[PDB]
Amino acid sequence: GASVPVMSTSYDVVVDREFDELLQGKDGLLVYHKMLSDGTVKNALNYIFGRIRSAKWYVEPASTDPEDIAIAAFIHAQLGIDDASVGKYPFGRLFAIYE
Amino acid sequence: ASVPVMSTSYDVVVDREFDELLQGKDGLLVYHKMLSDGTVKNALNYIFGRIRSAKWYVEPASTDPEDIAIAAFIHAQLGIDDASVGKYPFGRLFAIYENAYIYGMAAGEIVLTLGADGKLILDKIVPIHPFNIDEVLYDEEGGPKALKLSGEVKGGSQFVSGLEIPIWKTVVFLHNDDGSFTGQSALRAAVPHWLAKRALILLINHGLERFMIGVPTLTIPKSVWEAAKEIVKNFVQKPRHGIILPDDWKFDTVDLKSAMPDAIPYLTYHDAGIARALGIDFNTVQLNMGGQAINIGEFVSLTQQTIISLQREFASAVNLYLIPKLVLPNWPSATRFPRLTFEMEERNDFSAAANLMGMLINAVKDSEDIPTELKALIDALPSKMRRALGVVDEVREAVRQP
Amino acid sequence: ASVPVMSTSYDVVVDREFDELLQGKDGLLVYHKMLSDGTVKNALNYIFGRIRSAKWYVEPASTDPEDIAIAAFIHAQLGIDDASVGKYPFGRLFAIYENAYIYGMAAGEIVLTLGADGKLILDKIVPIHPFNIDEVLYDEEGGPKALKLSGEVKGGSQFVSGLEIPIWKTVVFLHNDDGSFTGQSALRAAVPHWLAKRALILLINHGLERFMIGVPTLTIPKSVWEAAKEIVKNFVQKPRHGIILPDDWKFDTVDLKSAMPDAIPYLTYHDAGIARALGIDFNTVQLNMGGQAINIGEFVSLTQQTIISLQREFASAVNLYLIPKLVLPNWPSATRFPRLTFEMEERNDFSAAANLMGMLINAVKDSEDIPTELKALIDALPSKMRRALGVVDEVREAVRQ
């Protein structure tokens, strides 16, 4: 196994990638939440999130072997992969979490 | 070798850097701050996306079946596919490379495990952030030997102090190595424009208020007051309130004597200059707005010369540090290795190429084995014609063999 | 030779340079500083990318099978491929050449090892930076003999002082050698514009504040004070605060009497002039913005005449210093050598060329061996038609067997 541990992105005033005290931790999350009521922000997210979802999602097998195809077919059915990426209920919930 | 690797140092230049504000870890804080600039981020999103989208594949060391089989193994380790999604480690390598672009150097520890077919396979790549690198250690000829690391273990359990990792356990990415083994941030030449933009925004702010609101003055008898302070305050804050004055008090705003200078074109000069400094050849601030060149496509192709170089630098690190470490434990006598490479994307010649594709198919149409004759005809074409059709991926063909 | 190589020196010109600020290693510091200018960096990123992307291949000394086999060996040593990624040493040669472009001269030590097939093969190229070159040493006819080096070993173990390396162990890249063996920075003719741009930015800064803010003046009785200093300070810093004056104090800003001069076009003249000075023939500061020529492609093609010359200069150094050093230990009687070369890219003629390719295929379609008849027909075409299809790489064909 690995001899090097995963370390934080921290140096001097940068703590876990963030230098601005107003945006550190959960206080920062309130700023981002407030930004959601800005029309330009919302306009941009509507486009980005739409385009992501519209990307013609499918399942690629681990190989062309019939066994790998059958496992892939099982996963395809679990997500409800279809032409519009509507899918079964859990599929759309994954995108909502990702947003 | 009779000549050692030497530092790129003379007079005020130490390891490629003359500006004391950007030397060593202090410099890394500047580059980190630049990441919260919208223009920087816009430019990185484009560059890093395009890099990743380059249709990565594996080329064998030769057409020999042995070299094909080794290349097919490497293809499977990375999960090479049409979208370059790949298996988990593949995307992690790009994330490490992005740090090297931003900061000058980054690395990852290569961790192997025993695979299902009796091969040593890639388990994971542990990223190593430049904030947590104390220094690179060198041998007596100036070749890199080890990384020495210090930093906090994620979650705060412990501080690591001077942990040494030999270089043969790592992949190291340097941006624009000049031969000394010293990487440099791609953001280096953008720092002046970034500083200038910020200073201009400050100056513009200070100007706009005075022209928008007016600087109120009230001249009152040498005799004389709360009412005077309230008049000037209310002019700024409550312009609807209106000003009642005795006949020996005089109210005026300061005559600035000119219209406000229009600083937007100078601001967008500096701001867009940030992206120019990264080798982007279309204006990333004005983007599609304003009167402009008809053939935007050509500026995007010019920008490809920058991005393709970055793709080569990524590939070369994978080819030197990672691939041999995956091949040698399973084929100990290997002297030549497969290479990660990509499809050159410089021009849009797809319509003409697809037309040529059609003529080749039509030519071989009455063959009893159309795929084999088509491939033989393709490999006989002159270079420019062959390359326009894309890659005839013999490694992919080997992998897809059930 | 009865004539020695002489320096390019006369009167104030010493080794091609007249400006004392750019002579010798002091000059190299100026060029290094220019690398942190955005316009310089933009131009180098494009030039160095385009050079690398030129579809590098190896041409044999002749069509003889022997020369083909030697060329195939060189092809394998460099890892010549469709993207010009190559094996590690290939990209290191370009990095050394980039130093020579920037600084005038750079070099690399060629290190060989015994390969698996009993051949001497390339192990590595040790780069030699111009900061670490003391001087080139010359024989009595003025031909280069050696490099003398001084510098710190990477990692700080030791200082190397006057190490001499014979020239036959090196590849030397010079940019624009004029025949004296003296390279010159490609940035030389960009220095005036670079200096002027920086001075203009300084001047613009000094102008903008005075027009944006106003230079406050307060005239007070000969009688007279802390309050006066605070009024002028607050006008600048706290314009919302507002000014209460006794009736014998008078506040005004300085009347500058004109609108601020618009210096942006003069600034962009100098700034874009930096790239012009490198032989780039499209505006790299304005780029796609503003009213402009319809056919940008043509300005890109003009720029190719500069870039292609750089490609020739790189190739010629590889062909003179490196390739013979790889051939001779394995074929000791070799007198003619393979050459690194590239595909000329001047014009976009791809749509017409692909149409011609189609007509050739259709013509040879009923052949019993389409690839052989197609190659014979191609090599018989007139030059312009043949070249438009691209390279029929016999060395590549040999390697792919």
Side-chain angles (χ1 to χ4, degrees), chain B residues 254-257 259-321:
Chain B
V254 175
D255 191 355
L256 305 179
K257 302 174 204 73
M260 188 176 160
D262 179 17
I264 292 342
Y266 188 49
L267 174 63
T268 62
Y269 165 79
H270 283 294
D271 197 359
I274 289 165
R276 302 196 295 273
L278 309 179
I280 293 170
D281 301 310
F282 55 86
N283 187 313
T284 65
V285 175
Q286 301 297 334
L287 289 168
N288 58 300
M289 295 315 305
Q292 50 180 279
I294 284 173
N295 182 6
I296 177 64
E298 187 57 45
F299 296 87
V300 175
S301 299
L302 297 171
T303 305
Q304 289 293 100
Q305 296 304 324
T306 295
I307 293 170
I308 292 166
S309 300
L310 304 175
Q311 291 159 18
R312 298 200 188 85
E313 159 182 282
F314 177 82
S316 162
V318 169
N319 297 338
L320 181 63
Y321 297 100

Coordinates of all heavy atoms in Angstrom, one line a residue, chain B residues 254-321, unseen atoms left out:
Chain B
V254 N -18.6 70.1 -6.0 CA -17.3 70.4 -6.6 C -17.3 70.3 -8.1 O -17.8 69.2 -8.7 CB -16.2 69.4 -6.0 CG1 -14.9 69.6 -6.7 CG2 -16.1 69.5 -4.5
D255 N -16.8 71.3 -8.8 CA -16.7 71.2 -10.2 C -15.5 70.3 -10.6 O -14.4 70.8 -10.5 CB -16.7 72.6 -10.9 CG -16.8 72.6 -12.4 OD1 -16.9 71.6 -13.1 OD2 -16.9 73.7 -12.9
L256 N -15.8 69.1 -11.1 CA -14.7 68.3 -11.6 C -14.2 68.7 -13.0 O -13.1 68.2 -13.4 CB -15.0 66.8 -11.5 CG -15.5 66.3 -10.1 CD1 -15.9 64.8 -10.1 CD2 -14.4 66.4 -9.1
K257 N -14.9 69.5 -13.7 CA -14.6 70.2 -15.0 C -14.5 69.3 -16.2 O -14.4 69.8 -17.3 CB -13.3 71.0 -14.8 CG -13.4 72.1 -13.7 CD -12.0 72.8 -13.6 CE -11.8 73.4 -12.2 NZ -11.6 72.3 -11.2
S258 N -14.6 68.0 -16.1 CA -14.5 67.0 -17.2 C -15.6 66.0 -17.0 O -16.1 65.9 -16.0 CB -13.1 66.3 -17.2
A259 N -15.9 65.2 -18.1 CA -16.7 64.0 -17.9 C -15.8 63.0 -17.4 O -14.5 63.1 -17.4 CB -17.3 63.6 -19.3
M260 N -16.3 62.0 -16.7 CA -15.5 60.9 -16.2 C -14.8 60.2 -17.4 O -15.4 60.0 -18.4 CB -16.4 59.9 -15.5 CG -15.6 58.8 -14.8 SD -16.8 57.8 -13.9 CE -15.7 56.3 -13.7
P261 N -13.5 60.0 -17.2 CA -12.7 59.2 -18.2 C -13.4 57.8 -18.4 O -13.8 57.2 -17.4 CB -11.4 58.9 -17.6 CG -11.3 59.8 -16.4 CD -12.6 60.3 -16.0
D262 N -13.5 57.3 -19.6 CA -14.1 56.0 -19.8 C -13.0 54.9 -19.7 O -12.2 54.8 -20.7 CB -14.8 55.9 -21.2 CG -15.4 54.4 -21.5 OD1 -15.5 53.6 -20.5 OD2 -15.6 54.1 -22.6
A263 N -12.9 54.2 -18.6 CA -11.8 53.3 -18.4 C -12.1 51.9 -18.8 O -11.2 51.0 -18.6 CB -11.3 53.4 -16.9
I264 N -13.3 51.6 -19.3 CA -13.6 50.2 -19.7 C -12.7 49.6 -20.7 O -12.2 48.5 -20.5 CB -15.1 50.1 -20.1 CG1 -16.1 50.3 -19.0 CG2 -15.4 48.7 -20.8 CD1 -15.5 50.2 -17.5
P265 N -12.4 50.3 -21.8 CA -11.5 49.7 -22.7 C -10.1 49.3 -22.2 O -9.5 48.3 -22.5 CB -11.4 50.7 -23.9 CG -12.6 51.6 -23.8 CD -12.9 51.6 -22.3
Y266 N -9.5 50.2 -21.3 CA -8.3 49.9 -20.6 C -8.4 48.7 -19.6 O -7.5 47.9 -19.6 CB -7.7 51.2 -20.0 CG -6.3 51.1 -19.4 CD1 -5.3 50.6 -20.2 CD2 -6.0 51.6 -18.2 CE1 -4.0 50.5 -19.7 CE2 -4.7 51.5 -17.7 CZ -3.7 50.9 -18.5 OH -2.4 50.9 -18.0
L267 N -9.5 48.7 -18.9 CA -9.8 47.6 -18.0 C -9.9 46.2 -18.8 O -9.3 45.2 -18.4 CB -11.1 47.8 -17.2 CG -11.6 46.6 -16.3 CD1 -10.6 46.3 -15.3 CD2 -12.9 47.0 -15.7
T268 N -10.6 46.2 -19.9 CA -10.8 45.0 -20.7 C -9.5 44.6 -21.4 O -9.1 43.4 -21.5 CB -12.1 45.0 -21.6 OG1 -11.9 46.0 -22.5 CG2 -13.3 45.2 -20.8
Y269 N -8.7 45.6 -21.7 CA -7.3 45.4 -22.2 C -6.5 44.5 -21.2 O -5.9 43.4 -21.5 CB -6.5 46.7 -22.5 CG -5.1 46.5 -22.7 CD1 -4.5 46.0 -23.8 CD2 -4.2 46.8 -21.6 CE1 -3.1 45.9 -23.9 CE2 -2.9 46.7 -21.7 CZ -2.3 46.3 -22.8 OH -0.9 46.1 -22.9
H270 N -6.5 44.9 -19.9 CA -5.8 44.2 -18.9 C -6.4 42.8 -18.6 O -5.7 41.8 -18.5 CB -5.6 45.0 -17.6 CG -4.5 46.0 -17.7 ND1 -3.1 45.6 -17.9 CD2 -4.5 47.4 -17.6 CE1 -2.4 46.7 -17.9 NE2 -3.2 47.8 -17.7
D271 N -7.7 42.9 -18.4 CA -8.5 41.7 -18.0 C -8.4 40.6 -19.1 O -8.0 39.4 -18.8 CB -10.0 42.0 -17.8 CG -10.8 41.0 -17.0 OD1 -10.2 39.9 -16.6 OD2 -12.0 41.2 -16.8
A272 N -8.6 40.9 -20.3 CA -8.5 39.9 -21.4 C -7.0 39.5 -21.6 O -6.8 38.4 -22.0 CB -9.0 40.5 -22.7
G273 N -6.1 40.4 -21.2 CA -4.7 40.1 -21.3 C -4.2 39.0 -20.4 O -3.2 38.3 -20.7
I274 N -5.0 38.7 -19.3 CA -4.8 37.6 -18.4 C -4.8 36.3 -19.2 O -3.9 35.5 -19.1 CB -5.8 37.5 -17.3 CG1 -5.5 38.7 -16.3 CG2 -5.8 36.2 -16.6 CD1 -6.7 38.9 -15.4
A275 N -5.9 36.1 -20.1 CA -6.0 34.9 -20.9 C -5.1 34.9 -22.0 O -4.5 33.8 -22.4 CB -7.5 34.8 -21.4
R276 N -4.8 36.1 -22.6 CA -3.7 36.1 -23.7 C -2.4 35.5 -23.2 O -1.7 34.8 -23.9 CB -3.5 37.5 -24.3 CG -4.8 38.1 -24.9 CD -4.4 39.3 -25.8 NE -3.9 40.4 -25.0 CZ -4.6 41.4 -24.4 NH1 -5.9 41.4 -24.4 NH2 -4.0 42.3 -23.7
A277 N -2.1 35.8 -21.9 CA -0.8 35.5 -21.3 C -0.7 33.9 -21.2 O 0.4 33.4 -21.0 CB -0.7 36.1 -20.0
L278 N -1.8 33.2 -21.2 CA -1.9 31.8 -21.2 C -1.9 31.1 -22.6 O -2.0 29.9 -22.7 CB -3.1 31.2 -20.4 CG -3.2 31.8 -19.0 CD1 -4.5 31.3 -18.2 CD2 -2.0 31.6 -18.2
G279 N -1.8 31.9 -23.6 CA -1.7 31.5 -25.0 C -3.1 31.2 -25.6 O -3.3 30.5 -26.5
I280 N -4.2 31.8 -25.0 CA -5.5 31.8 -25.6 C -5.6 32.9 -26.6 O -5.3 34.1 -26.3 CB -6.6 31.9 -24.5 CG1 -6.6 30.7 -23.7 CG2 -7.9 32.0 -25.2 CD1 -7.5 30.8 -22.5
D281 N -6.0 32.5 -27.8 CA -6.0 33.5 -28.9 C -7.3 34.0 -29.4 O -7.4 34.5 -30.5 CB -5.2 33.0 -30.1 CG -3.8 32.7 -29.7 OD1 -3.2 33.6 -29.1 OD2 -3.3 31.5 -30.0
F282 N -8.3 33.9 -28.6 CA -9.6 34.6 -28.8 C -9.9 35.3 -27.5 O -9.4 34.9 -26.4 CB -10.7 33.6 -29.1 CG -10.9 32.5 -28.2 CD1 -11.7 32.7 -27.0 CD2 -10.3 31.3 -28.4 CE1 -11.9 31.6 -26.1 CE2 -10.5 30.2 -27.5 CZ -11.3 30.4 -26.4
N283 N -10.6 36.5 -27.6 CA -10.9 37.4 -26.4 C -11.9 36.7 -25.5 O -13.1 36.5 -25.9 CB -11.3 38.7 -26.9 CG -11.5 39.7 -25.8 OD1 -12.1 39.4 -24.8 ND2 -10.9 40.9 -26.0
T284 N -11.5 36.4 -24.3 CA -12.3 35.7 -23.3 C -13.2 36.6 -22.5 O -14.0 36.1 -21.6 CB -11.5 34.7 -22.4 OG1 -10.6 35.5 -21.6 CG2 -10.7 33.8 -23.2
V285 N -13.1 37.9 -22.6 CA -13.9 38.8 -21.8 C -15.1 39.4 -22.6 O -16.2 39.4 -22.1 CB -13.0 39.9 -21.2 CG1 -13.8 41.0 -20.5 CG2 -12.0 39.3 -20.3
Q286 N -14.8 39.8 -23.8 CA -15.8 40.2 -24.8 C -16.5 39.1 -25.4 O -17.7 39.2 -25.7 CB -15.1 41.1 -25.9 CG -14.4 42.3 -25.4 CD -15.3 43.3 -24.8 OE1 -16.5 43.3 -25.0 NE2 -14.8 44.1 -23.8
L287 N -15.8 38.0 -25.6 CA -16.3 36.7 -26.1 C -17.1 37.0 -27.5 O -16.5 37.6 -28.3 CB -17.2 36.1 -25.1 CG -16.5 35.4 -23.9 CD1 -17.5 35.1 -22.8 CD2 -15.7 34.2 -24.3
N288 N -18.4 36.7 -27.6 CA -19.1 36.8 -28.9 C -19.6 38.3 -29.1 O -20.2 38.5 -30.2 CB -20.3 35.9 -29.0 CG -21.3 36.1 -27.8 OD1 -21.0 35.9 -26.7 ND2 -22.5 36.4 -28.2
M289 N -19.5 39.2 -28.2 CA -20.0 40.6 -28.3 C -19.1 41.5 -29.0 O -17.9 41.4 -28.9 CB -20.3 41.2 -26.9 CG -21.3 40.5 -26.1 SD -22.8 40.1 -27.0 CE -23.2 41.7 -27.6
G290 N -19.7 42.4 -29.8 CA -19.0 43.5 -30.5 C -18.6 43.1 -31.9 O -18.6 41.9 -32.2
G291 N -18.3 44.1 -32.7 CA -17.8 43.9 -34.0 C -16.6 43.0 -34.0 O -15.7 43.3 -33.2
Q292 N -16.5 42.0 -34.9 CA -15.4 41.1 -34.8 C -15.1 40.3 -36.0 O -15.8 40.4 -37.0 CB -15.4 40.2 -33.5 CG -16.7 39.5 -33.2 CD -16.5 38.6 -31.8 OE1 -15.9 37.6 -31.9 NE2 -16.9 39.1 -30.7
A293 N -14.0 39.6 -36.0 CA -13.6 38.7 -37.1 C -14.7 37.7 -37.5 O -15.4 37.2 -36.6 CB -12.4 37.9 -36.7
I294 N -14.9 37.6 -38.8 CA -15.9 36.6 -39.2 C -15.5 35.1 -38.8 O -16.3 34.4 -38.2 CB -16.1 36.7 -40.7 CG1 -17.0 38.0 -41.0 CG2 -16.8 35.4 -41.2 CD1 -17.1 38.3 -42.4
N295 N -14.2 34.8 -39.0 CA -13.8 33.4 -38.8 C -13.2 33.2 -37.4 O -11.9 33.1 -37.2 CB -12.8 33.0 -39.9 CG -12.3 31.6 -39.9 OD1 -12.8 30.8 -39.0 ND2 -11.4 31.2 -40.7
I296 N -14.0 33.1 -36.4 CA -13.7 32.8 -35.0 C -13.0 31.5 -34.9 O -12.1 31.3 -34.1 CB -14.9 32.9 -34.1 CG1 -14.5 32.5 -32.6 CG2 -16.0 31.9 -34.5 CD1 -13.6 33.5 -32.0
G297 N -13.4 30.5 -35.8 CA -12.8 29.2 -35.8 C -11.3 29.2 -35.9 O -10.6 28.4 -35.3
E298 N -10.8 30.1 -36.7 CA -9.3 30.2 -36.9 C -8.6 30.6 -35.6 O -7.5 30.1 -35.4 CB -9.0 31.1 -38.0 CG -7.5 31.2 -38.4 CD -7.0 29.8 -38.8 OE1 -7.6 29.1 -39.6 OE2 -5.8 29.4 -38.3
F299 N -9.2 31.5 -34.8 CA -8.6 31.8 -33.5 C -8.6 30.7 -32.5 O -7.7 30.5 -31.7 CB -9.2 33.1 -33.0 CG -9.0 34.3 -33.9 CD1 -9.8 34.6 -35.0 CD2 -7.9 35.1 -33.7 CE1 -9.6 35.7 -35.8 CE2 -7.6 36.3 -34.5 CZ -8.5 36.5 -35.5
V300 N -9.6 29.9 -32.6 CA -9.7 28.7 -31.8 C -8.6 27.7 -32.2 O -8.0 27.1 -31.4 CB -11.1 28.1 -31.8 CG1 -11.2 26.7 -31.0 CG2 -12.2 29.0 -31.3
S301 N -8.4 27.5 -33.5 CA -7.3 26.7 -34.0 C -5.9 27.2 -33.6 O -5.1 26.4 -33.3 CB -7.3 26.6 -35.6 OG -8.5 26.0 -35.9
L302 N -5.7 28.5 -33.6 CA -4.4 29.0 -33.1 C -4.2 28.7 -31.7 O -3.0 28.3 -31.3 CB -4.4 30.6 -33.2 CG -4.5 31.1 -34.7 CD1 -4.7 32.6 -34.7 CD2 -3.2 30.8 -35.4
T303 N -5.2 28.8 -30.9 CA -5.2 28.4 -29.5 C -4.9 26.9 -29.3 O -4.2 26.6 -28.3 CB -6.5 28.8 -28.8 OG1 -6.9 30.1 -29.0 CG2 -6.5 28.4 -27.3
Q304 N -5.3 26.1 -30.2 CA -4.9 24.7 -30.1 C -3.4 24.5 -30.1 O -2.9 23.5 -29.5 CB -5.5 23.9 -31.2 CG -7.0 23.6 -31.1 CD -7.3 22.7 -29.9 OE1 -7.7 23.3 -28.9 NE2 -7.1 21.4 -30.0
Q305 N -2.5 25.3 -30.7 CA -1.1 25.1 -30.6 C -0.6 25.1 -29.2 O 0.3 24.3 -28.8 CB -0.4 26.1 -31.6 CG -0.7 25.8 -33.0 CD -0.4 24.3 -33.4 OE1 0.6 23.7 -32.9 NE2 -1.2 23.7 -34.2
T306 N -1.2 26.0 -28.4 CA -0.9 26.1 -26.9 C -1.3 24.8 -26.2 O -0.6 24.2 -25.5 CB -1.5 27.3 -26.3 OG1 -1.0 28.5 -26.8 CG2 -1.4 27.3 -24.7
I307 N -2.6 24.4 -26.5 CA -3.2 23.4 -25.7 C -2.6 22.0 -26.1 O -2.4 21.2 -25.2 CB -4.7 23.4 -25.9 CG1 -5.3 24.7 -25.2 CG2 -5.4 22.1 -25.1 CD1 -6.7 25.0 -25.5
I308 N -2.3 21.8 -27.3 CA -1.6 20.6 -27.8 C -0.3 20.4 -27.1 O 0.1 19.3 -26.7 CB -1.5 20.5 -29.3 CG1 -2.9 20.4 -29.9 CG2 -0.6 19.4 -29.8 CD1 -2.9 20.7 -31.4
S309 N 0.5 21.5 -26.9 CA 1.8 21.4 -26.2 C 1.6 20.9 -24.7 O 2.4 20.1 -24.2 CB 2.5 22.7 -26.1 OG 2.8 23.1 -27.4
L310 N 0.5 21.4 -24.1 CA 0.2 20.9 -22.8 C -0.2 19.4 -22.8 O 0.2 18.7 -21.9 CB -1.0 21.7 -22.2 CG -0.8 23.2 -22.2 CD1 -2.1 23.9 -21.7 CD2 0.4 23.6 -21.3
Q311 N -1.0 19.0 -23.8 CA -1.2 17.5 -24.0 C 0.1 16.7 -24.1 O 0.1 15.6 -23.5 CB -2.1 17.3 -25.2 CG -3.6 17.8 -24.9 CD -4.3 18.1 -26.2 OE1 -3.9 17.6 -27.3 NE2 -5.4 18.8 -26.2
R312 N 1.0 17.2 -24.8 CA 2.3 16.5 -25.0 C 3.1 16.4 -23.7 O 3.7 15.3 -23.3 CB 3.2 17.1 -26.0 CG 2.7 17.1 -27.4 CD 3.8 17.4 -28.4 NE 3.2 17.5 -29.8 CZ 2.7 18.7 -30.3 NH1 2.8 19.8 -29.6 NH2 2.2 18.6 -31.5
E313 N 3.0 17.4 -22.9 CA 3.8 17.5 -21.6 C 3.1 16.5 -20.6 O 3.8 15.8 -19.9 CB 3.7 18.9 -21.2 CG 3.9 19.3 -19.8 CD 3.8 20.8 -19.6 OE1 4.9 21.5 -20.0 OE2 2.8 21.4 -19.1
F314 N 1.8 16.4 -20.6 CA 1.1 15.4 -19.8 C 1.4 14.0 -20.2 O 1.8 13.1 -19.4 CB -0.4 15.6 -19.9 CG -1.3 14.6 -19.2 CD1 -1.5 14.7 -17.9 CD2 -1.8 13.6 -19.9 CE1 -2.2 13.7 -17.2 CE2 -2.6 12.6 -19.3 CZ -2.8 12.7 -17.9
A315 N 1.3 13.7 -21.5 CA 1.6 12.4 -22.0 C 3.1 11.9 -21.7 O 3.2 10.8 -21.3 CB 1.4 12.3 -23.5
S316 N 4.0 12.8 -21.9 CA 5.4 12.5 -21.7 C 5.7 12.1 -20.2 O 6.5 11.2 -20.0 CB 6.2 13.7 -22.1 OG 7.5 13.6 -21.5
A317 N 5.1 12.8 -19.3 CA 5.2 12.4 -17.9 C 4.6 11.0 -17.6 O 5.2 10.1 -17.0 CB 4.6 13.4 -17.0
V318 N 3.4 10.8 -18.2 CA 2.8 9.4 -18.1 C 3.7 8.3 -18.7 O 3.9 7.2 -18.2 CB 1.4 9.4 -18.6 CG1 0.8 8.0 -18.8 CG2 0.5 10.3 -17.7
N319 N 4.2 8.6 -19.9 CA 5.1 7.7 -20.6 C 6.4 7.4 -19.9 O 6.9 6.3 -20.1 CB 5.3 8.2 -22.0 CG 3.9 8.2 -22.8 OD1 3.0 7.5 -22.5 ND2 3.9 9.1 -23.9
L320 N 7.0 8.4 -19.2 CA 8.3 8.3 -18.6 C 8.1 7.6 -17.2 O 8.8 6.7 -16.8 CB 9.0 9.6 -18.5 CG 10.4 9.6 -17.9 CD1 11.4 8.8 -18.6 CD2 10.8 11.1 -17.7
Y321 N 7.2 8.1 -16.4 CA 7.1 7.7 -14.9 C 6.1 6.7 -14.7 O 6.3 5.9 -13.7 CB 6.7 8.9 -14.1 CG 7.7 10.1 -14.1 CD1 7.4 11.2 -14.9 CD2 8.8 10.0 -13.3 CE1 8.3 12.2 -14.9 CE2 9.7 11.1 -13.4 CZ 9.4 12.2 -14.2 OH 10.3 13.3 -14.3

